Ligand binder design. Structure first.
Ligand SMILES: *[C@@H]1O[C@H](CO)[C@@H](O)[C@H](O)[C@H]1NC(C)=O
Ligand SMILES: *[C@H]1O[C@H](CO)[C@@H](O)[C@H](O)[C@H]1NC(C)=O
Length: 274
């Protein structure tokens, strides 16, 4: 049976008023910060990073500062938008190259590095949109092969942030089928009828965790106390946390997002139940 792990992953980059990345890591509330989102990519070779107006000039320094404090920083690709797809093996490999040379251990004269010499700690796949033609499995495998634990490089935490419902959309299922994802953040705060904190998340949680034994599962909760899917701390303590932790592959809690958490201080208590 699983149990508390003390792990709390939070999303950052959705609202410039949420403070700098450095501030997030300095709060001592998170064990991982995931920036969002690289929202444009595909078979045409055009890539875009959208951090909602945040000052990009200081992100590199903040990333390194976070890492020095033991807080890894990841980059989520995708999002709720419609500007991305990965319809071929070639497009998947080109995206890997772009990520590698722009944010990780790669270096190419023609490719600028948004955060300078900072080297990110992971990649999260937030694939709201996709088709059976997408090849996220090819991208995932390449990223997994660069998760080095005993050689020239550093660990790369490969994750996916998915909808509550099981089974997942085909393109997500194809990627997860590789079996090499380290963590999956199951969003239980979407309005999805039959599958959210109000009703059905537990059943889906059972299916998700059982289907991917090698992957650690995080319960995704919203820090927006105005949401109909918000879970009061006392209900996380006596309900959500205990139930989620019954599974052997429970990994922790994911929070959406830094902005909301900053306004409600949700993690102040939640980090103790994770
Ligand atoms: C694309 O990659 C997948 C997985 O490696 C492979 O099964 C498929 O044959 C590839 N498509 C081709 C033939 O380029
Ligand atoms: C949570 O703590 C912060 C500390 O700065 C405080 O500003 C905030 O008002 C608190 N949350 C509430 C009750 O709004």
């Amino acid at each position: 049976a699983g149990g508390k792990t003390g792990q709390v992953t939070v999303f950052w980059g959705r609202n410039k008023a949420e403070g700098s990345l450095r501030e997030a890591c300095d709060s001592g509330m998170y064990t991982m910060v995931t920036m969002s989102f690289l929202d444009v990519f595909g078979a045409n070779g055009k890539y875009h990073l959208d951090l909602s107006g945040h000052d990009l000039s200081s992100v590199g320094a903040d990333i390194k500062h976070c890492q020095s404090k033991g807080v890894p920083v990841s980059l989520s690709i995708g999002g709720y938008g419609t500007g991305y797809s990965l319809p071929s093996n070639r497009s998947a490999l080109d995206l890997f190259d772009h990520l590698w040379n722009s944010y990780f251990g790669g270096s190419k004269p023609s490719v600028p590095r948004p955060f300078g010499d900072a080297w990110l700690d992971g990649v999260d796949l937030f694939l709201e949109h996709g088709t059976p033609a997408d090849r996220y499995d090819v991208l995932a495998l390449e990223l997994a092969k660069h998760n080095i634990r005993g050689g020239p490089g550093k660990p790369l935490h490969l994750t996916a942030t998915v909808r509550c419902g099981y089974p997942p959309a085909a393109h997500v299922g194809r990627a997860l089928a590789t079996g090499i994802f380290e963590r999956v953040h199951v969003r239980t705060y979407e309005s999805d009828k039959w599958c959210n904190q109000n009703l059905g998340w537990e059943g889906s949680w059972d299916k998700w965790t059982a289907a991917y034994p090698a992957t650690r599962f995080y319960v995704g909760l919203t820090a927006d106390d105005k949401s109909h899917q918000w879970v009061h701390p006392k209900n996380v303590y006596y309900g959500v946390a205990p139930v989620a932790q019954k599974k052997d592959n429970y990994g922790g809690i994911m929070l959406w997002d830094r902005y909301f958490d900053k306004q409600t201080n949700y993690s102040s208590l939640i980090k103790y139940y994770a």
